[PDB]
Amino acid sequence: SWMTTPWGFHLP
Amino acid sequence: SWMTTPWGFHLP
Amino acid sequence: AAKDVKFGNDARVKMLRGVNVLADAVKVTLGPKGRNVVLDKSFGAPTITKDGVSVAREIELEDKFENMGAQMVKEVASKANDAAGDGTTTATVLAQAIITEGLKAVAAGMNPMDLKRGIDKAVTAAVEELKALSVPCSDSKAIAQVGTISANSDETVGKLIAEAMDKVGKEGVITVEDGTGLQDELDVVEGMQFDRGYLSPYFINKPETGAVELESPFILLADKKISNIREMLPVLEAVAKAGKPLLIIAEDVEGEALATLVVNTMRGIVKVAAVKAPGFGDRRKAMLQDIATLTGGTVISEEIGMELEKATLEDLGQAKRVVINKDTTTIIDGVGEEAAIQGRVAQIRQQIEEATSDYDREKLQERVAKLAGGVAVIKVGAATEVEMKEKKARVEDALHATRAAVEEGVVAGGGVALIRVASKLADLRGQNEDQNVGIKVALRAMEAPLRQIVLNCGEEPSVVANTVKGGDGNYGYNAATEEYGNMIDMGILDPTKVTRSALQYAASVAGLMITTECMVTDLPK
Amino acid sequence: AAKDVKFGNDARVKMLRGVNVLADAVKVTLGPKGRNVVLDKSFGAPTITKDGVSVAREIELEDKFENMGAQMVKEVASKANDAAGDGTTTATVLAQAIITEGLKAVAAGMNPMDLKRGIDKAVTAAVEELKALSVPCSDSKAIAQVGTISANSDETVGKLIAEAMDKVGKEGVITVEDGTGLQDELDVVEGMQFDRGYLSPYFINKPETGAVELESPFILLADKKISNIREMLPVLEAVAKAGKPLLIIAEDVEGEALATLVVNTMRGIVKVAAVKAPGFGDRRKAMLQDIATLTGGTVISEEIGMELEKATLEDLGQAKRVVINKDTTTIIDGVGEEAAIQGRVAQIRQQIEEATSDYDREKLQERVAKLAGGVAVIKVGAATEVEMKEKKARVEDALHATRAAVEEGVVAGGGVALIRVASKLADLRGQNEDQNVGIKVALRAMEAPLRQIVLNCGEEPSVVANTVKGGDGNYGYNAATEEYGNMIDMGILDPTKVTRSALQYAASVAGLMITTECMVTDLPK
Amino acid sequence: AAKDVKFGNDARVKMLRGVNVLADAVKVTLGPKGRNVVLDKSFGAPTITKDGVSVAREIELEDKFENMGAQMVKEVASKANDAAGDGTTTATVLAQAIITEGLKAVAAGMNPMDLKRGIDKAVTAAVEELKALSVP
Amino acid sequence: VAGGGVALIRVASKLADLRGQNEDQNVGIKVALRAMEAPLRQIVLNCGEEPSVVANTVKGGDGNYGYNAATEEYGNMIDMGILDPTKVTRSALQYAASVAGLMITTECMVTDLPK
């Protein structure tokens, strides 16, 4: 479940 | 099925 | 899962093998001449250590019954660790000696219950003799001496410890802390500690120290058994948006409420660490209110209807630091108003004034001391980072040793006190032959630590043991210089509590192992 | 997971086997006549190298205890690598020699502690003799000579190194850089370096050099322990939309904050590379402000309330380059205003003027030197790409060698200095027979590097060792030309620090291995 | 008959094992508190003896090299028996001690000839001191 | 001479300063001197006491002081009747030394096949 920001950040 | 809050809480 | 069951001699043999493996791994590190033990890690170079606790932690074997034996010995080694703070290797050595001799006697055909009775009687007499032998250490010069001896003969550490205990009393709370400059600093702040532990080891952010440290955190007080983490949610959102840690003092955090907090902490968001509310009954509420007025927060009691989920940040108090060790938590420099705490201690001493029974007076006086004492903060001073860490570790070791020495005094180190005690009990007898055999087993095992120290040094254990037994008083053998002399005069000292606890827990585990008859484990598959 | 435990002679035998395997793999590359070692890659042709570090990196065996031995030797080989910059093979050879002899002596039945004491005493005496033997190298002609010798007898490299150290001082910071034309260029820019390392090796974008290189990056300064990457997010968005790398100087980046950055870097977006804030206490804040005024940025301190997530691009400073090596980071040509840094150094020297204690004067003078020194940038000049890379590698090797030589002087190379030192200590004795045996073990092992060099050359090690020992002074054996002569006159030189560090770390690991008694690893399954 | 040949450390290890077996069998009978050794005969009850000579006579092992070691020690035990008439067990104990320590030193890496010279010098000095100590 | 291994111990104590030409010779001398105490230790071990303690106690004394294993006591060995001919001890020591030297200098061994 890695949230992805619209600019591409792969938030873990 | 871990619900995630908008601020990131990983509710189990 | 199907179980394998072993009875009698087979179970005893398996336990003895496991105990021998664990003790042989551990005991090579005893004394100043201890050997090195190489422990493998998942990656990189293996760690090389001379610490018994680290070695004992990794030891557990593939055979299930030998694993039983090793785990049972490790349990009381840890128990002795958490009682006095030192002497785990000594306790393990004593436990191995008593277990070996007792199992040999049992295999010879003696009644295990009588052997256990004899061992218990011998240990009780030994504790009495050891209390008689101990000398007081409450004098400030003795404090400085103990602090120096513990911290590798460093005068500064002893001076700091003596100053702290003079400024906040012998029983006052003292906490070590990292300094700023090369000069050491000691002061007192409004705070206190209470005997509670973390619900799970998963909040530990200091693995080397085994403690949960939160810097400038919020505190959530709850006079209710906290469950249903849905109720918890809003205060965690408020705390996380503020970028602060959280310390929860609740009556009891149930299941699904500590697991959720644990998962949140490991995932990274929120640095919460729950803890049980100290006390019970009306005392629990009274000391919860005392903590609230110390930290400046408000106790969130469901009895009147605060409705936990409706709590805000203003309800939570604040403090400079909180440190949660294995069994106690210390709040250091809470933001509570000085007028509020002064009024609270005035109220509690007023309650003392009309207190009727001695129990009420004692309890309220305890609260008064806790509130009005404060905690001493020792700021370690040095030039660089490595010196900062070494100085802090030395100071905290010296603090532990000095606290134990103040508690129960000091005796001759190097296993000399145990040898003298054993020599003083050469005439003790039981009710029958097996009890006498158990007494002799305990007395013989009481000389194991000195023999192990000598063996690590490289000399002949029997010769040195005989020479020490021939002498009297504080006569003993210095392994560091490989000579003989008065142990007290050459600085080798041991707190009485450390040796007493090691002996008592070793005896307890030895009796439990001796009386064991059947063992049930899982199948090897 | 169940553990396998080995005691005494078995553990020593396993360690000795592992050490022998690793050292036999490594030592064939020692000296100018070193052999080739073929290392297998995942695909394609295997790499053929004559470098000890590359060979040692790949070595690790299937047996867990032999793997222990190999890893422990590798650890001190790397430690010697990171202290002086060269001599890993020499340190490994010395460690193998001492370990072999010491384990043989232990198996003979000598006390390991006494052997360790003897080895330590011999090594201390050897260090003293080696310091006595070293000749100064601070003269500019000596600088040119060392630079030439290191860079395969190239005059241009020595001239560049000498010019750089004359222009920025002996202790000044010098950084090599790719040029533009065939002519070499040397200049100075506003910048400085501080002793901090990358939190994880995962930001390394220069695997051959083992460093993190960022070109024209932003710098994020934070006087706070950075965690909760949610706070980090906006500045990373601002940086990524600008297409620049990021260098984070924070007090300490916690967990979930360095892992997130690592994942972002490997995935491709953002080239961030965090680093610890240099210094501690008020010194940390002072030097953070100095870095801020050097780079033209602003220190984002949470104490006053910058609220990290609210930081913008203007808050971040800029610099031409940043290079993060294993233990130091260099900022080269920061965009900070010259007036700002001039005012800062004026302020710091004013603080020097009213400084009371010598510690304050020394620290503030250190800051003044760091700010007003600058960094020298050497632009390597050549025609093509391969010449660019070879010239850069040669210049940086010569820079390392020259820095070491300036630090501690130079001695005869080819293992001659160690042989002379060992000959000078033929009368050293300990307290008992085992200590003397340890001293003799150390002295005998001190001749291993020359014998290994000769053996790689193909001659008889014993004959050449005896011939060298018969001579005196700088008399030695040139393996490149296979002749005898004055080592200094024929250019074979070695920095004193390199040999001293190799000897010291070899002795440390040998003592640790000799005193080892038990080893605990995972099960073979 | 084809021969098996062993060199250096292997031969020394085999000899040491044989010597240890023989000496451990013999030395338990030394002194007034000596233990009993049970020797099997072809028939009847086994003989129980506390005499070192009787025990040493029966000892010889199945491994040829260990048998070498045992026989070489037995030879000088008998030689001491036929010179003074007593002290075979004492001679065997001394031989085992010296052999064990000397083989350990040799495995450590010392020159065997120098060790032999040192042992001979020490024994000569000991004989002189012992002659001095004796009373008429 | 004094029996019970006492004479050998006294002789070994009297030669604590003997040295050879190099380190290996000194090691051999120390090996011989250390082995000279084996009979008393073995006697004590058969008696059941601690060999090291009794050996140290005997070495601490002087003259005919020794340990009677029959009565498990200490005293003057000559006075309590424990006596040993000088020739017996001398011969035992000499032949033990001879066989030890022969075994130490042995380099190769040739025997029949196990079959």
Structural domain boundaries, residue D57: 1-134+410-524
Q: What does the alpha-carbon distance between residue E23 and residue E99 come to, in Å, rounded to a whole number?
A: 11
Choose, out of E7, E68, E133, the residue to mutate when testing the contact with F (most F CBs < 10 Å): E133
Query: Is F84 annotated among the ligand-binding residues?
Result: yes
Enumerate the residues of chain A whose CB falls inside 8 A of the CB of residue B2. 1
Q: Taking the CB of residue D189, how many other CB atoms lie within 10 A of it?
A: 16
Q: What does the alpha-carbon distance between residue D172 and residue D191 come to, in Å, rounded to a whole number?
A: 11
Q: Using alpha carbons, select from C206, C202, C180 the residue that is nearest to residue C323.
A: C206
The technique by which this structure was obtained is cryo-EM
Q: Please state the φ and ψ torsions of residue D471, each to the nearest 5 degrees.
A: -75, -170
Contact criterion met (CB below 8 Å) for C32 and C479 = yes
Resolution to 1 decimal, in Å?
2.5
What is the domain-level CATH number for residue D484?
1.10.560.10
Last residue of a domain, one of D356, D387, D409: D409
Give me the number of domains chain D comprises: 3
Chains near A (3 or more Cβ pairs under 8 Å) = B, D
- Helix, strand, coil % in chain C, rounded to nearest 5: 50, 15, 30
Strand-pairing partners, residue D185, are: D379
Enumerate the residues of chain E whose CB falls inside 8 A of the CB of residue D104. 108-109
Last residue of a domain, one of D385, D409, D433: D409
CA-based nearest distance F111→chain C, Å: 41
- The residue of chain E with its CA nearest to that of D105 is E108
Are D259 and A5 an interchain contact pair (Cβ–Cβ within 8 Å)? no
Residue D445: half-sphere exposure toward Cβ, Cα within 13 Å: 29
Q: Using alpha carbons, select from F17, F9, F57, F60 the residue that is nearest to residue F35.
A: F9
Last residue of a domain, one of C351, C371, C391: C371
Nearest to C39 among D257, D282, D520 (CB): D520
Pairing of strands C246-250, C218-222: parallel
Q: What does the alpha-carbon distance between residue D416 and residue D424 come to, in Å, rounded to a whole number?
A: 12
Show the 3-state SS of C83-137: HHCCCHHHHHHHHHHHHHHHHHHHHHCCCHHHHHHHHHHHHHHHHHHHHHHCECC
What is the domain-level CATH number for residue D218?
3.50.7.10
Are D435 and D316 within one domain?
no
**What's the burial of C466, exposed, middle or buried (CB within 10 Å: 0-12/13-18/19+)?**
middle
Structure letter (DSSP) for residue D310: G
Q: What does the alpha-carbon distance between residue D458 and residue E13 come to, in Å, rounded to a whole number?
A: 35
Choose, out of A1, A2, A4, A9, the residue to mutate when testing the contact with D (most D CBs < 10 Å): A9
Q: Judge whether C255 is closer than 8 Å to chain D, CB to CB.
A: no
Q: F 17-56 residues with CB below 8 A of C?
A: 50, 52-53, 56
Enumerate the residues of chain B whose CB falls inside 8 A of the CB of residue A3. 4
Q: What does the alpha-carbon distance between residue D433 and residue E110 come to, in Å, rounded to a whole number?
A: 15
Are D246 and D359 within one domain?
yes
Are D243 and D274 within one domain?
yes
Contact criterion met (CB below 8 Å) for C467 and C475 = no
Q: Which amino acid is at D512?
A: L
Enumerate the residues of chain C whose CB falls inside 8 A of the CB of residue D3. 58-61
Contact criterion met (CB below 8 Å) for C313 and C239 = yes
Nearest-10 Cα torsion for D23, D24, D26, D27: 90
Contact criterion met (CB below 8 Å) for D288 and D223 = yes
CA angle, D263 then D268 then D274, to 5°: 55
Structure letter (DSSP) for residue F14: H
Q: B 1-12 residues with CB below 8 A of A?
A: 2, 4, 10
Are C152 and C3 within one domain?
no
Q: Using alpha carbons, select from D415, D414, D409, D484 the residue that is nearest to residue D445.
A: D415
DSSP-derived 3-state class of residue C61 = coil
Contact criterion met (CB below 8 Å) for F104 and E8 = no
Are C63 and C154 within one domain?
no
Nearest-10 Cα torsion for C77, C79, C82, C86: -30
DSSP string, D415-446: THHHHHHHHHTTT---SSHHHHHHHHHHHHHT
Which residues have a Cβ under 8 Å from the Cβ of C451 and sit 6 or more positions away?
C415, C461, C462, C464, C465
Q: Please state the φ and ψ torsions of residue C139, each to the nearest 5 degrees.
A: -70, 145
Query: Is F68 annotated among the ligand-binding residues?
Result: yes
Two structure tokens written together for C202: 């998963």
Are E69 and F103 an interchain contact pair (Cβ–Cβ within 8 Å)? yes
**What's the burial of D492, exposed, middle or buried (CB within 10 Å: 0-12/13-18/19+)?**
buried
Are D151 and D179 within one domain?
yes
Q: What does the alpha-carbon distance between residue D31 and residue D448 come to, in Å, rounded to a whole number?
A: 12
Two structure tokens written together for C402: 């000095």
Query: Is C494 annotated among the ligand-binding residues?
Result: yes
Contact criterion met (CB below 8 Å) for D386 and D178 = no
Strand-pairing partners, residue C176, are: C378
Q: What does the alpha-carbon distance between residue C454 and residue C32 come to, in Å, rounded to a whole number?
A: 10
Are C31 and C11 within one domain?
yes
DSSP-derived 3-state class of residue C306 = coil
Are C319 and C220 within one domain?
yes
Are B7 and C240 an interchain contact pair (Cβ–Cβ within 8 Å)? yes
Pairing of strands F65-68, F73-76: antiparallel
Q: What does the alpha-carbon distance between residue C224 and residue C252 come to, in Å, rounded to a whole number?
A: 7
Q: Using alpha carbons, select from D229, D377, D253, D247 the residue that is nearest to residue D317.
A: D247
CA angle, C54 then C57 then C60, to 5°: 135
Breaks in chain C (C to N > 2.5 A) come right after none
In C36-87, where does DSSP find H-type helix? 52-58, 64-84
Sole residue written with tokens 């630090």: D407
Q: Please state the φ and ψ torsions of residue C203, each to the nearest 5 degrees.
A: -85, 0
Structure letter (DSSP) for residue D249: E
Detail the DSSP E strand segments found in A1-12. Answer: 3-4, 10-11
Are C155 and C116 within one domain?
no
Are C68 and C198 within one domain?
no
Q: What does the alpha-carbon distance between residue D479 and residue D31 come to, in Å, rounded to a whole number?
A: 8
Which residues have a Cβ under 8 Å from the Cβ of C58 and sit 6 or more positions away?
C39, D3, D520
Are C360 and C381 within one domain?
no
Contact criterion met (CB below 8 Å) for E77 and E92 = yes
Q: Using alpha carbons, select from D327, D218, D325 the residue that is nearest to residue D271.
A: D218
Q: Using alpha carbons, select from D412, D393, D394, D421 the residue that is nearest to residue D495.
A: D412
What is the domain-level CATH number for residue C392?
3.30.260.10
Element (H or E) spanning E6, and its range? strand E3-7
Choose, out of D232, D280, D300, the residue to mutate when testing the contact with C (most C CBs < 10 Å): D280
In D85-154, where does DSSP find H-type helix? 88-108, 112-133, 140-150
Which residues have a Cβ under 8 Å from the Cβ of D44 and sit 6 or more positions away?
none
Q: What does the alpha-carbon distance between residue D287 and residue D277 come to, in Å, rounded to a whole number?
A: 9
What is the end-to-end Cα distance of chain D in Å, rounded? 10
Question: How many residues are there in chain C?
Answer: 525
Are C259 and C217 within one domain?
yes
Rounded to a whole number of angstroms, the CA Rg of chain B reads: 6
* Long-range contacts of residues F10-14, Cβ cutoff 8 Å, at least 24 apart: F10/E133, F10/F62, F10/F63, F11/E126, F11/E129, F11/E130, F11/E133, F11/F36, F12/E126, F12/F36, F12/F37, F13/F59, F14/E129
Contact criterion met (CB below 8 Å) for C34 and C28 = yes
Q: What does the alpha-carbon distance between residue D456 and residue D441 come to, in Å, rounded to a whole number?
A: 23
Q: Taking the CB of residue E10, how many other CB atoms lie within 10 A of it?
A: 12
Pairing of strands D173-178, D375-380: parallel
